[PDB]
Amino acid sequence: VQLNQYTLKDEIGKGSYGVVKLAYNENDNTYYAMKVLSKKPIEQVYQEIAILKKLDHPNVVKLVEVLDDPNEDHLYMVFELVNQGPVMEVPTLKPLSEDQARFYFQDLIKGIEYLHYQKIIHRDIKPSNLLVGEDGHIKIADFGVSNEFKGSDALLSNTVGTPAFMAPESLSETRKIFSGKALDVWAMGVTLYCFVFGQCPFMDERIMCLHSKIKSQALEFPDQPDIAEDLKDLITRMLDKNPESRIVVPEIKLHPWVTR
């Protein structure tokens, strides 16, 4: 499979939309990641590309070029490869150590904080969108459902992303308005829980009960592995079900587990 100067190889990931394939560029003799999309509405992909074109940061993926012929049904986004892949698979029986989780969480904070400064709400923070680069650091991937905003926060009404990671205030069925920065914080908390426990804090195979637990089940910590109380404190604050009192990113940065 050859698309201009690129040679498509095997699938390496499957995102919110198309697939990602390893691609080899014959010009410069280099591997890239290629998101492959087929027109199935189509507006949102060019919102994604616009957001991508604006982002230049070491903890965010780098869009290299877009291949769009008006005649072929497929559309290609070329990203710089992030070779080690997702930071972890969820669920797992081998979660990260606290020191590992701290290391990666620190990257996650700097990226989210950059995104929020650039006025992007990511809306799909989770371990499989956190890719480990050549140097061992995290890069945030997949802006397929992200939101851009004007002013100091986003004022959202739609429900998107991955169910297990959706903040409770995005799950009223009366179409209410909710702010966007707190949605990313919630997902960071579910993510940090996954790092150290290897599974999600709210699991159910019936979607109705997964929503019910997210909205109404008190956060429970497993006996094993026994984690530090300050890490418990931080997760508890990020998974505060009330977005008004949920911890903000400038406070997360100062948290004693984080600076430890």
Ligand X SMILES: O=C1c2ccccc2S(=O)(=O)c2cc(-c3nnn[nH]3)ccc21
Binding site for ligand X (CB under 6 A): 12-13, 15, 20, 33, 35, 61, 79, 81-83, 85, 131, 141-142
Q: Rounded distance, CA 40 to CA 37, Å?
A: 9
Residue 126 marked in a binding site: no
Residue 14 marked in a binding site: yes
Q: What is the DSSP string of 184-240?
A: HHHHHHHHHHHHHHSS-SS--SSHHHHHHHHHHPPP---SSS---HHHHHHHHHHT-
Residues 6+ apart with CB under 8 A from 85: 12, 13, 131, 132
- Among residues 130 and 182, whose Cβ is nearest to ligand X? 130
Asked if residues 231 and 237 have their Cβ atoms less than 8 Å apart, the reply is no
Least distance in Å: CB of 2 to ligand X?
20
Selecting among 28, 99, 124, 226, the annotated active-site residue is: 124
Least distance in Å: CB of 251 to ligand X?
29
Least distance in Å: CB of 109 to ligand X?
20
Residue 68 annotated as catalytic = no
Judged by beta carbon distances under 5 to 8 A according to partner kind, the member of Cl ion, ligand X, none in contact with residue 231 is: none
- Among residues 127 and 161, whose Cβ is nearest to Cl ion? 127
Q: Would you list which residues are annotated within the binding site?
A: 12-20, 35
Residues labelled catalytic: 124
